[PDB]
Design a protein around this ligand. Structure first.
Ligand code: CLA
Ligand code: CLA
Ligand code: CLA
Ligand code: CLA
Ligand code: CLA
Ligand code: CLA
Ligand code: CLA
Ligand code: CLA
Ligand code: XAT
Ligand code: 8CT
Lengths: 73, 193, 92, 207, 195
């Protein structure tokens, strides 16, 4: 439908106007959309941390009824 | 340049000698590219012009229409009168008030937001003109607002950061000092130590 | 025919105002600047059928050409301001 | 040329160029030139404060303890911490800091750019200068010395400054121990030199 | 150029010897920088005039009328308008009063403020020279005006350090001293000698 954003032309305009990052984000949407492993490294990193984030909340904020009563579960 | 901010330092190279209010003050080396600098020239102007107009509203209504710049204006509405502005009561109510603010500003600013030119934005002229349009007179007056704005901005902090310390409004916090300059100063306060 | 049915009718007109008043300028100006592609080519000619950028639904005789999906994109924002104002009743 | 001890070094990076130079820099702080420049001024600013300051300790307590004439309010130099009267130590302090720091940043930004702290347009009025590097001259030498005794006068400033600095440190450490005033520490020793010495009390007495 | 302040000669090199009454006085050597002396030539003459105008002013306050100087504002701090200048009290209040002397003086200075010439500004002539006593020789008169000026300024200090000391305003002090010379001094009752 032509209304929206373009992944690459979001990125390519983020090279900071100094040069601290040099070309900034440029041709990344190339590497990302081509490399699978790059996409998979993010997936595990993103999902991996959340797995832990689950465990950090789920003992302290025991969503389910009558846990923290039976402990060993 | 109309002077140096710190006598004994050289002029920074990247700042071209002709800019409104160029004191050669850029300690952080913020803009070392004149490309990027220009947007912050345009923006320092705007932040001032709002800041200018904001200051009298803070002083006056403390010492004139009798309300603080902070808690009095906003609080009195929720639990009370719709508006006391100028010691008078209009019809307009809370929610539908801010609704008008988006139509207008979003209409006022966005209409300015679209221009090709940088200079005709910062300095529109046109219908806004009726004052010096010409030569050195405008060039000089060009410095005068940039300079007053800097002062006007730098006040705004003093409005906020006194009120967080004192709790009294800006004039009420001012009048205290002129009566007794010692013991009413900032030094004795929860600020310093 | 009272405030609940009046406000959302009176609120939506705010966003569609700004959209045509001005922001028809800037939205159209980025859309021309932003177009999706992959491997330097758009998604139609890379073999993806479902991805063909679709203007054939998007036209109008409206003076500036303001179209159906821009009604959808702004009208939805018109319904954001709608259900923020009535639904809250939070600090006035 | 005089040496701190006659038989040692005069380190390579240090020749006898500047006055008050006896060839003592064991820890070798000054080595590169643009540093030694700095410390030389850091010495004099100390040397100058120490001279003036010590007389603030010495003379007032001396008067009181040299007789009834003009007894020094604030008693010993460390009993003048008390006796503020008019203004609170909160304000009077930050009045100093703001007031001094104006003058002393002016002193630094001169060392940075030597020729003129302030050229004639900026900092309205004032700006007389007449300034050589390392010494202000100008205002700060009203009677117009540097009449040709300079080199000697320079030696006489440092050498007295060196001593008043070192002597000041005594006032600290003495009072920190014997709890008395200097002339009390003075005379009590001069009274009986042996028992009233150092190292019979509290400090080397740890033995 | 007339003589020198102290008879130790060494008239300082830098000076516009025609300047109105340079005795060759720079113990501190402030004006060595010529562009800077350009400023301090006017700063003097404009200071003195407002001593030259004030010194008689502070003189009549304490002699004829009531109050010396620091008595004047605080006498009318509770009073306000109640002055007497050859006449009564046109009503004005401290906040309203200062507006006149601040704003009317600002422009009056501001008209002089920007003057492309440094000579043209301090010595305008014309409307400020109604009489025309400039004649062909102002150089005698210029030095003439300064010697009155420097003394006027230096007189003003004699008001402020007396009254800031235990001493009071000069007019009675003038009489006080001429009453008893021994016992009216900066030392006696002045406590200016701190021994
Ligand atoms: C009777 C005491 C007295 C003395 C000794 C002075 C002395 C001086 N006045 Mg002055 N003045 C006086 C009373 C006095 N004033 C009164 C009563 C008023 C108000 C009616 C003024 C209003 C006044 C103005 C408006 C101006 C002077 C200026 C000057 C300076 C001109 C000298 C110059 O150009 O050299 C070079 C300039 C110098 C300033 C020499 C430096 C000498 C000392 C060390 C500087 C001290 C300045 C002072 C501490 C600034 C802080 C105070 C202020 C910010 C509140 C000189 C230092 C001029 C100036 O620039 O000073 C403000 C000037 O334009 N006078
Ligand atoms: C910089 C912009 C700015 C902003 C955002 C405000 C905001 C405000 N001002 Mg205000 N004010 C400003 C500049 C500003 N002021 C300036 C420059 C002046 C001097 C001319 C005033 C003089 C002023 C007065 C005299 C009063 C306020 C009041 C108020 C408050 C009520 C608003 C209102 O009824 O306006 C409605 C404005 C209009 C209907 C005018 C339409 C154009 C509000 C917080 C009032 C207050 O203190 O609380 C009620 C009040 O009595 N202002
Ligand atoms: C235009 C600048 C300006 C001015 C005129 C004032 C004025 C005042 N402030 Mg203030 N203030 C300001 C900015 C300013 N403030 C800002 C930006 C801050 C945040 C850092 C503060 C934080 C502050 C505190 C925490 C307190 C005050 C207080 C006061 C009052 C007593 C003076 C004092 O304690 O100094 C305040 C100290 C400063 C402003 C330090 C900044 C000084 C800068 C470097 C220069 C200021 C002078 C500037 C050139 C303008 C003056 C021009 C001159 C001709 C008058 C007085 C009404 C006190 C008060 O009223 O007590 C009841 C108090 O408690 N202010
Ligand atoms: C803190 C005060 C101070 C400072 C900054 C200096 C600075 C200096 N002195 Mg010095 N001096 C001082 C006090 C000071 N002196 C005192 C009190 C004495 C007499 C005991 C001397 C006796 C002395 C001699 C005999 C000589 C110097 C020399 C020097 C210069 C080269 C050595 C150097 O790099 O010093 C850098 C030193 C410092 C930055 C001080 C740092 C202090 C450290 C960090 C802690 C030390 C604590 C201490 C043990 C107590 C330098 C400008 C030499 C020279 O040629 O200069 C003319 C030289 O021959 N001084
Ligand atoms: C706002 C007040 C203020 C400011 C900005 C300065 C600034 C400075 N002082 Mg300083 N000083 C001040 C007040 C101030 N002083 C007071 C009140 C005293 C007591 C009389 C001194 C006594 C003093 C001495 C004795 C010396 C300095 C020195 C210095 C310089 C180096 C400081 C340094 O190493 O920082 C390090 C950073 C921190 C401490 C933080 C610097 C220009 C030194 C200097 O000029 O060396 C050449 C030096 O030797 N100052
Ligand atoms: C040149 C400076 C100088 C002078 C003239 C004196 C002189 C004196 N000090 Mg003294 N002192 C000094 C520096 C000086 N000190 C310094 C820098 C320190 C700290 C390290 C001390 C620490 C100190 C203590 C702790 C005591 C004295 C005491 C005394 C008195 C007895 C002599 C003595 O034990 O000294 C000892 C001197 C030294 C250890 C430093 C050597 C001085 C050099 C060699 C001279 C050159 C005598 C009046 C004592 C006193 O009066 O008791 C009543 C006492 O209790 N002083
Ligand atoms: C503020 C007033 C003021 C100013 C700006 C000047 C300015 C000038 N005078 Mg001048 N003068 C004054 C007052 C003043 N004078 C007074 C009151 C007297 C009578 C004592 C003289 C007597 C005098 C002589 C005899 C000569 C000059 C000369 C000069 C010129 C070079 C000297 C210079 O740079 O001074 C710059 C002035 C200042 C920087 C003002 C500093 C004031 C400080 C801040 C106050 C000090 C007060 C003091 C320590 C305590 C009071 C003691 C009492 C003597 C007043 C210069 C244009 C010489 C010249 O070339 O003739 C034109 C010359 O030969 N003057
Ligand atoms: C030129 C410098 C000067 C300045 C700034 C002042 C300033 C002042 N004079 Mg003053 N005065 C001066 C010269 C000056 N005098 C001279 C040269 C004379 C001698 C004629 C007087 C004689 C004089 C008298 C007799 C009185 C003052 C008074 C006053 C005070 C009230 C001002 C007023 O209404 O004026 C008065 C002028 C007018 C009403 C004219 C308005 C048109 C004010 C502090 C009054 C005062 O302080 O009370 C003791 C007062 O009673 N003045
Ligand atoms: C400035 C100073 C003291 C200043 C004192 C002042 C102002 C006193 C102020 C007061 O009294 C009054 C006025 C009035 C009282 O009511 C208040 C106080 C406040 C109490 C001491 C410096 C004191 C400085 C001292 C003691 C320095 C000693 C340095 C030595 C011995 C050698 C250093 C070296 O640098 C070399 C030379 C070579 C390197 O290689 C080796 C090392 C060691 C690094
Ligand atoms: C022909 C004609 C007459 C004269 C000239 C003129 C130019 C005016 C022209 C105008 C014609 C008109 C009236 C056009 C109106 C078009 C409109 C109002 C279209 C409606 C758009 C709104 C849409 C899709 C809804 C979008 C999404 C909504 C709500 C959802 C809101 C939500 C709620 C509150 C609950 C869940 C959370 C979520 C999703 C935020």
């Amino acid at each position: 439908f032509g209304i929206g954003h373009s992944m690459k032309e979001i990125l390519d305009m983020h090279t900071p106007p100094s040069g601290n990052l040099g070309a900034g984000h440029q041709n990344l949407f190339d590497t990302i959309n081509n490399s699978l492993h790059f996409q998979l490294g993010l997936a595990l990193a993103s999902a991996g941390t959340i797995c832990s984030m689950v465990a950090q909340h789920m003992y302290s904020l025991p969503a389910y009824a009558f846990i923290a009563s039976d402990f060993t579960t | 340049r109309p002077g140096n901010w710190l006598p004994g330092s050289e002029a920074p190279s990247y700042l071209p000698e002709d800019l409104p209010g160029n004191y050669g003050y850029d300690p952080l080396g913020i803009s070392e590219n004149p490309a990027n600098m220009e947007r912050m020239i345009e923006c320092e102007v705007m932040n001032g012009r709002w800041a200018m107009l904001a200051v009298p509203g803070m002083l006056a209504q403390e010492a004139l229409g009798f309300g603080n710049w902070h808690d009095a204006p906003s609080w009195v509405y929720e639990g009370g009168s719709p508006t006391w502005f100028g010691a008078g009561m209009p019809i307009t109510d809370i929610k539908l008030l801010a609704v008008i603010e988006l139509v207008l500003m979003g209409g006022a600013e966005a209409m300015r937001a679209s221009e090709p030119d940088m200079e005709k934005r910062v300095y529109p002229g046109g219908a806004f003109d009726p004052a010096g349009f010409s030569k050195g007179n405008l060039a000089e007056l060009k410095l005068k607002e940039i300079k007053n704005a800097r002062l006007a901005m730098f006040a705004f902090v003093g409005f906020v950061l006194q009120y967080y310390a004192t709790g009294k409004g800006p004039v009420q916090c001012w009048t205290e000092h002129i009566a007794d300059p010692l013991g009413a100063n900032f030094a004795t306060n929860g600020t310093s130590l | 025919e009272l405030s609940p049915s009046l406000v959302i009718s009176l609120s939506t007109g705010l966003s569609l105002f700004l959209g045509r008043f001005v922001f028809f300028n800037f939205q159209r100006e980025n859309v021309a600047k932003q177009v999706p592609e992959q491997n330097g080519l758009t998604h139609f000619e890379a073999g993806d059928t479902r991805a063909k950028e679709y203007v054939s639904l998007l036209k109008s005789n409206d003076p500036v050409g303001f179209n159906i999906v821009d009604v959808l994109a702004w009208g939805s924002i018109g319904h954001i301001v709608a259900y923020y104002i009535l639904a809250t009743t939070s600090n006035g | 040329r005089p040496i701190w001890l006659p038989g040692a070094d005069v380190p390579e990076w240090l020749d006898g160029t500047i006055p008050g130079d006896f060839g003592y820099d064991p820890l070798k702080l000054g080595k590169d030139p643009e540093t030694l420049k700095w410390y030389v001024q850091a010495e004099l600013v100390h040397g100058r404060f120490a001279m003036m300051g010590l007389v603030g300790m010495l003379v007032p307590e001396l008067l009181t303890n040299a007789g009834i004439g003009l007894p020094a309010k604030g008693t010993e130099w460390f009993n003048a911490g008390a006796a503020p009267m008019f203004a609170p130590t909160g304000v009077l302090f930050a009045m100093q800091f703001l007031l001094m720091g104006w003058a002393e940043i002016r002193r630094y930004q001169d060392f940075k750019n030597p020729g003129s702290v302030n050229v004639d347009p900026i900092f309205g009025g004032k700006l007389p200068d007449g300034n050589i590097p390392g010494y202000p001259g100008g205002i700060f030498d009203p009677f117009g010395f540097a009449k040709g005794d300079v080199d000697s006068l320079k030696l006489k400033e440092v050498k007295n400054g060196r001593l008043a600095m070192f002597a000041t440190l005594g006032f600290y450490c003495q009072a920190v121990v014997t709890g008395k005033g200097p002339i009390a520490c003075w005379t009590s020793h001069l009274a009986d030199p042996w028992a009233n010495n150092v190292w019979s009390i509290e400090l080397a007495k740890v033995i």
